[PDB]
């Protein structure tokens, strides 16, 4: 089959963490152990080009040739922590891995055979229409998750198959199971290379080669059965009712260097240093779109339980929200009332989107796994997580809000209005979601996002126009309030409803005003809070608000565009 | 400026009452708000509501459903309709005007006596 | 809603002598307080605004005082043409509301 | 020495998960084995006296007589997850149990000569003094940490010790020297009970019984050595290599009434029932507060991170504020300034207090624990956690926004003003911390109650009487502005302010207001809004708080009472 | 702050005839607007007020109309006594600022 | 209701300008605002300040920390002071008052010449 060979790799990251290590690892069970910290992980992480190339500073060969290009789209993966869709069922992941990953040529026949192959050699046949695990609906085993896992991996029928960590936490019948599932796809002529942690007799038994690494230094190299006896002649006796790893393991604990050298002049290292002498996009961007979209979407409805507890409290605010203003009315505290109304409605479309944060972060694993595997591009990626996540949960409350409140509260009853006033509502949502999606794209936690969001709405919030009276404020602070995205929300709102009332019964003030102070109409009003009356002045506030959303969604793209995916 | 109210003096329990006041000497949509005022035997004055110069109205809260106040701009004219009476709806019923910069009842109307009886 | 009250109801008094009638507010009025005077057979008549202020066509005789909940109208040498029957009204919220009235009587 | 004795145990929850089951644990290694659900850590709990006594239906003995009533108090218990004090040092956290737990007539000499036996023996005197772990600071090693949790149980010289899973978490060398040391522990007649996860055979060779559990079932009570021989007997042959616990658990998972019945049908069976037959506050009140007080201000300081942020807030927040409304004035601008900025400093009181369901949520499994023990009553921790860390933490905020904007702004300048200023902030700050810990305390997740402090702090926000104007509510609504925290401090911050301040400047309204609606004074801004202008309209509001605070902190304290510690 | 702009600094008319002058804000006035005249040798002396109502003391034949920020006065049957300079006054914002003025002289 | 400036007509530069303002026929104390207003050569108006009825100030920020205007209500009078002087204050000073209910300048002083030169 396949030979991957490993000669004098060194990997510094700058301490190095891998030294001088070599071997070779050929069709069949080949095994990886040692400490926690040891360098197993690492040099899986190299053999597999899962590191950066810089650190790297040995040979690999394939075969006796060196790495092409698209090796990393030839080689199945199998990471530690499953990213199986939970949402979805093993045949809906497998089509998703087929639909990406197989050439568009073939026809979706051909795919499906593919998959009913994979489903039956994994034995999978019986959950292939089960949702794989879903915290809200309970799913099929862990050892069914990890054999979905294998199968997304095998679709493309690689040559070469690596997992990371293949049975840590699965059950210990679990664990003979799946390496019993791998002993058998080995024989076929397939290679597989993983490093395991604490196995079993049991377990240990099936192995075809060992690579045992300690402190980034090759312990012992060779095959599997023979490490009992080299460490036998190294010295030291192997008790009866003993592991023979966790024999291995208590050698390592107790040097090291002595034990490398030790192991240098043996025989093995001299057979493999012989060897080693001796040998010496797939679619279109619309079909990435697509199906990124359609899982997104299923895997939105699938799990409901967060989209349903934001509408449900959308509808009961908007309710309760109509009951208290029921009614307004053009008197004395008829400002008062409109001005406080549409104010919150604002800050809310804010304070409600910080929950953006978690579109990108809660799949940043899942995300890099898949660009490395050649999935998808991340503009692909970028625009179907936008088009199936944001755009719709982004929109359902403004429209709610506005259907629910505009006739209960009585607000102007011109259907140009109606239409302006959800509009408006939309592009606030929108600003504020893209500018969370800016401030927290490619992270791995969003403790630190969400307090900068949270200050930053605080601060925005106050220069929105009705804390402050922002034509009151010095002149050097004053430019601060084109930042603020409430602001420009809160005054077309303002400007929207305010035009042409009258709030001084009896006291007719459209001609003249009779007394200084009295402040009668909506134009007083307005132009007292610095707002423009002509039309341009309504609509220089959505302007600003498009190109904010245009800056932001950008800069998200660019953090996402240059993360480290490695 | 002037005012003058009109109508019939005499209601039959449940029916609808209905009074007229003509205004003379200003324009009813011009600037102020136009107010129903009633004067029970054994002298209470009770504010019912008014419309405003621009069309809008108020209403006393005591009177639920039953009070309407329209107008008519061609002849200078406002309306009161009170539906459902009773004989406790007996009073004299007057018309006045309302400036607002001020506060006041200005100008009122000389009262029409309104009886509910069968 | 603010409810208005008027102390006495009626009020003997004697030509040439002074009088005072009070209001009392449930809630603070601000000085949006009128006083209305109505002989029999007719329309009650605007008398003072604003507590304090006095409409033009009625004599020095008339004034108006008060600050809060509580105010007063003083009738200085009564005459014979000051008999009748004297509110008080709020114009500070909407439901506006009279007070009892209080009717003046020679003795 | 003690001789625990358990005869005919059965435990239901009305589900039965422990089964028949009876055994004796002598002094020395006494280990329960089997799978994570079997009944290894309940059977452990029945016998510390752990759990609720409704389910037991047994018999347990010690020395031959029933457990009395203060058994938790003279049997120490290791907890599985450490509950020791990060922030305080090894030295530290024997102190705070040897005050709690000693009796106080012992002077302080003999209780630091105590310790110093129980560290020597532990060998902790290389970290004596040395912080346990701080996840802001590096701490001692994992190993270290679990022998402080040892030494804490050991302070009282108990004669039973129980354990949960001592070795679950740790490294192969440290799970040795911990055992090791148990192993020493038990040679000098104290009785160590524990239970296990996945031993190895070097931990295995250590034990000296051996109580096998699965199902609720008792597979196997004997001494440890023997249950090779009681298996081999069953018809099971033993491989090489092969680490006998995983034997068992192999055994065991492959049925289980069969293996039941025969170990029934054996002769440790016979002689263990042989055996059963024949057999058939310490402090003060203010001591336990101190220490509590102590304890909770040293972790407080120790762990800096949250109070330094939300300080640093304050202070920025104060700056930012007191520049964007430097220099309040008296004209049609000033009422809605002065409005503004009081409005957003009370509502920022409440909803920076939703912090404070972390309070009780964090520490709930190490209140439940000590309070197990018999270190404190609830009374003397509840008041001790409230002293400690509410008290100053709600305290600073409310001086240094006082401090910093009062003069800034220039709010009234006299000295009556700017004090009750500060103390209606106080107030309105414990009204909404003690909200929080009422609807917080006793609970495991914050995620629910956070969400509905949430939503009962913007329902109060709108009923504070900026944002809707509380005198034009329907009647049947309106009662409910008396459960808003916001309104009676926002009320009373306005009363003090705005009370004989004039706004229409060249305009004098004192006298009397010319035009009928031009709102010329705070009089009639203070009306407006519904306030009374008495004396008495201004305390009601600290009244209405300091009740709220007296109900809320009640609530809660009930809420520790009544929750079943367990 | 508001600028006012007269669009004439000066303007030469005859006796009877009609005369109109102009006044531009740089921002929304709202009717808070007025018209001064001043003879040499004297202070300003108040017009209109309001952007429409005429001072006592003044004939018929002054009048002022204006809306937004556009603001006219209206002369017609100019006479000998009105000879001078005008200058339109926004008094919405607090730097209150007048415009440069407007001298009528005789042909 | 009547008023009258009076004070020195020559400055020397860098020098401190001070005038006093005299009200007869009302109390200065009791209802409106009372303003200082100059008038270059080559006539244009400038709004300078004001003192509140009950002492409040509001200055015109194109003269910052130079004006000050205090008050003396037991002989009803209020002041002007303008420092270090430029001979670009040169300017006929007025005195003037200001309703607030209404909005205008409705009473003025006669007027007073500053020179300020060397
Ligand atoms: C109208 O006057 C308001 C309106 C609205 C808020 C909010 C706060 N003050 C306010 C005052 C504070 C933020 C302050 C401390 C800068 N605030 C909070 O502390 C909580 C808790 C929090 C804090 C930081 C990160 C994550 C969560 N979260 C919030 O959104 C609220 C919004
Ligand atoms: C002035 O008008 C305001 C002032 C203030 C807020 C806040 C919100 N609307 C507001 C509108 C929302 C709460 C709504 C959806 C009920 N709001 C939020 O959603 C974030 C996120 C959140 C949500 C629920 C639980 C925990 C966190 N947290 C907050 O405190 C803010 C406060
Ligand atoms: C509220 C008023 C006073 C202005 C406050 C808004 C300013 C401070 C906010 C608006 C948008 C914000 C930016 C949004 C996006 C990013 C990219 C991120 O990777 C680092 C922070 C950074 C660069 C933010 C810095 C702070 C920022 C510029
Ligand atoms: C750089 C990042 C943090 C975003 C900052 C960009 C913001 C501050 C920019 C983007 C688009 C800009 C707006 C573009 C168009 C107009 C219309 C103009 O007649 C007034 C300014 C106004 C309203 C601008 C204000 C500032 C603005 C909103
Ligand atoms: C105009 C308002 C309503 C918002 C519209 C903005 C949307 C349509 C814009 C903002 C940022 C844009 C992205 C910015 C950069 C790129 C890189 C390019 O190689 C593929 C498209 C992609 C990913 C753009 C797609 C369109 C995009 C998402
Ligand atoms: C409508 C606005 C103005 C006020 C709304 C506040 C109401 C809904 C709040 C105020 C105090 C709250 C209570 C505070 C404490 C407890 C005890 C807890 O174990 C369950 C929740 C419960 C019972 C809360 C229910 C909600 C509650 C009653
Ligand atoms: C049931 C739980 C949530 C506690 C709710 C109790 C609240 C609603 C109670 C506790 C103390 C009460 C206050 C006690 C005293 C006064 C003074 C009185 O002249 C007006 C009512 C007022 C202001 C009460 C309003 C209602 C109040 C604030
Ligand atoms: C300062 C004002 C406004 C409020 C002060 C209220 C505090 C001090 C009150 C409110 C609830 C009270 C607790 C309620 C119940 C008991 C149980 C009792 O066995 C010991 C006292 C103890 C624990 C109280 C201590 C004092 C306490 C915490």
Redesign the pocket.
């Known amino acids: 089959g396949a030979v991957l060979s490993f000669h004098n790799i060194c990997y510094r990251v700058e301490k190095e963490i891998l030294s001088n290590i070599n071997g070779i690892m050929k069709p069949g069970l080949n095994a990886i152990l040692g400490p926690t910290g040891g360098g197993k992980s690492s040099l899986l992480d190299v053999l597999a080009a899962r590191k950066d190339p810089s650190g790297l500073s040995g040979d690999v060969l394939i075969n006796g040739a060196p790495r092409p290009a698209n090796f990393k789209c030839n080689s199945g993966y199998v990471v530690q922590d499953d990213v199986v869709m939970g949402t979805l069922t093993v045949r809906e992941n497998l089509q998703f891995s087929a639909a990406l990953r197989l050439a568009t040529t073939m026809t979706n026949h051909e795919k499906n055979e593919r998959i009913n192959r994979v489903i039956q050699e994994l034995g999978l046949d019986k959950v292939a229409d089960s949702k794989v695990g879903t915290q809200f609906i309970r799913g099929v085993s862990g050892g069914e998750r990890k054999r979905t896992s294998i199968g997304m991996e095998l679709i493309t029928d690689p040559s070469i198959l690596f997992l990371d960590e293949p049975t840590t936490g699965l059950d210990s019948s679990t664990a003979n199971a799946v390496l019993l599932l791998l002993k058998r796809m080995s024989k076929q002529g397939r290679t597989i290379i993983f490093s395991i942690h604490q196995p079993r007799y049991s377990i240990f038994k099936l192995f075809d080669s060992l690579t045992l690494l300690a402190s980034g230094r090759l312990m012992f190299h060779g095959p599997a059965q023979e490490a009992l006896g080299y460490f036998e002649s190294a010295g030291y006796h192997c008790e009866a009712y003993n592991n023979p790893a966790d024999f291995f393991l208590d050698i390592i604990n107790g040097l090291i260097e002595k034990l490398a050298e030790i192991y240098v002049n043996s025989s093995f290292y001299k057979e493999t240093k012989a060897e080693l002498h001796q040998l010496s996009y797939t679619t279109s961007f619309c079909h990435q779109l697509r199906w990124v979209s359609k899982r997104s979407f299923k895997n939105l409805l699938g799990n409901p339980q967060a989209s349903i507890a934001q509408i449900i409290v959308t509808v009961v605010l908007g309710l309760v929200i109509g009951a208290i203003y029921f009614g307004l009315k053009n008197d004395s505290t008829g400002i008062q009332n409109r001005a406080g109304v549409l104010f919150f409605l604002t800050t809310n479309q804010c304070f409600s989107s910080v929950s953006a944060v978690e579109l990108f972060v809660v799949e940043k694993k899942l995300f890099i796994h898949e660009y490395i595997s050649g999935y998808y591009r991340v503009?692909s990626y970028?625009?179907g997580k936008?088009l199936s996540d944001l755009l719709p949960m982004r929109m359902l409350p403004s429209i709610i809000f506005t259907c629910i409140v505009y006739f209960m509260l009585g607000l102007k009853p011109k259907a140009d209005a109606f239409f302006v006033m959800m509009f408006t509502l939309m592009?606030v949502a929108?600003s504020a979601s893209s500018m969370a999606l800016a401030i927290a794209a490619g992270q791995s936690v969003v403790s630190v996002a969400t307090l900068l969001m949270t200050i930053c709405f605080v601060f925005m919030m106050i220069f929105s126009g009705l804390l402050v009276n922002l034509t009151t404020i010095a002149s050097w602070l004053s430019w601060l309030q084109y930042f603020s995205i409430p602001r420009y929300g809160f005054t077309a709102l303002q400007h929207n409803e305010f035009l042409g009332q009258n709030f001084c019964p009896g006291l007719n003030a459209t001609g003249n005003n009779p007394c200084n102070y009295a402040t009668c109409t909506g134009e007083e009003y307005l132009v007292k809070q610095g707002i423009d009356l002509s039309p341009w002045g309504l609509w220089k506030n959505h302007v600003a608000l498009?190109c904010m959303?245009?800056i932001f969604?950008?800069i998200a793209?660019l953090k996402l565009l240059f993360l480290k995916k490695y | 400026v002037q005012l003058q109210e009109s109508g019939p003096g005499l209601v039959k329990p449940s029916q609808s009452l209905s009074l007229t006041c003509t205004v003379t000497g200003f324009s009813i949509t011009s600037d102020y708000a136009w107010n129903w005022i009633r004067q029970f035997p054994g002298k209470k004055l009770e504010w019912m509501g008014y419309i405003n110069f621009d069309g809008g109205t108020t209403y006393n809260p005591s009177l639920r459903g039953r009070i309407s106040i329209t107008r008519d701009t061609s002849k200078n004219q406002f309306f009161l309709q009170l539906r459902s009476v009773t004989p406790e709806d007996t009073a004299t019923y007057y018309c006045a005007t309302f400036y607002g910069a001020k506060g006041t009842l200005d100008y009122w109307g000389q009262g029409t006596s309104v009886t509910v009886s069968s | 809603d603010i409810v208005l009250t008027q102390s006495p109801s009626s009020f003997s008094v004697s030509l040439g002598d002074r009088v005072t009638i009070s209001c009392k507010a449930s809630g603070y009025i601000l000085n949006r307080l009128a006083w209305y005077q109505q002989k029999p057979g007719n329309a009650p008549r605007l008398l003072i605004s604003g507590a304090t202020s006095l409409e033009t066509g009625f004599p020095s005789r008339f004034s108006g005082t008060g600050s809060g909940k509580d105010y007063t109208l003083s009738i200085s040498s009564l005459q014979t043409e000051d008999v009748g029957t004297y509110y008080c009204q709020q114009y500070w919220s909407t439901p506006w509301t009279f007070g009892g009235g209080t009717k003046l009587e020679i003795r």
């Open positions: 503009s970028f625009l936008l592009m929108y498009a959303i245009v969604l950008t793209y």
